[PDB]
Paper text:
Here we use deep network hallucination to generate a wide range of symmetric protein homo-oligomers given only a specification of the number of protomers and the protomer length. Starting from only a choice of chain length L and oligomer valency N (2 for a dimer, 3 for a trimer, etc.), the method carries out a Monte Carlo search in sequence space starting from a random sequence. The loss function guiding the search is computed by inputting N copies of the sequence into the AlphaFold2 (AF2) network, and combining structure prediction confidence metrics (pLDDT; per-residue structural accuracy, and pTM; an estimate of the TM-score) with a measure of cyclic symmetry (the standard deviation of the distances between the center of mass of adjacent protomers within the predicted structure). To eliminate such over-fitting, we generated new sequences for the HAL backbones using the recently developed ProteinMPNN sequence design neural network (accompanying manuscript: Dauparas et al.).
Numbering used by the authors:
A (entry chain D): 5 to 68
B (entry chain F): 6 to 68
C (entry chain E): 4 to 68
The structure:
Amino acid sequence: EEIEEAVKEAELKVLAIVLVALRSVSHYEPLSRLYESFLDALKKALSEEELKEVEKEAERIEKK
Amino acid sequence: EIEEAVKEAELKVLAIVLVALRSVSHYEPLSRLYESFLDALKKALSEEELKEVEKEAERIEKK
Amino acid sequence: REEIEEAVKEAELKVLAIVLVALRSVSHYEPLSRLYESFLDALKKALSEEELKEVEKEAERIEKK
């Protein structure tokens, strides 16, 4: 069925949680290096639309 | 039907990250990422979800 | 069915590969080194050896781009 879709929602939600956490601390040395590392790894591993979906889910979490 | 098993993937990955962050939360500034992560966990998941990551993290820590 | 087991496992292991790649590439800075080692130890407890092997392949895949 749509297993691919359901698998992807879980990926994107976990990765958005990690993104929120790294973002909060991204100006303490050297966590800024891990922030940019994580973002680089997301860009390589996810499609462009998925990456935008991670970033949107992160902002949703960050306004909560 | 299956978002239940979707959820188990989530909580088990989050539990593995939590375990890694707990074992180094005494090396600064990692304690800030440990707290940021617990703060992101609390925001993003219901309390039942949070406690499942916790118990899964305990089962991992006991291995 | 068995399509959901391969599903959950697959989601789990690519996400862990992404985090692994992120940590690996900054592991010389301290104490990011320590969080890297500690992630590797957590993977060793939580994952089987074939799950760990699959995480590392996905990690090399990502690093290769």
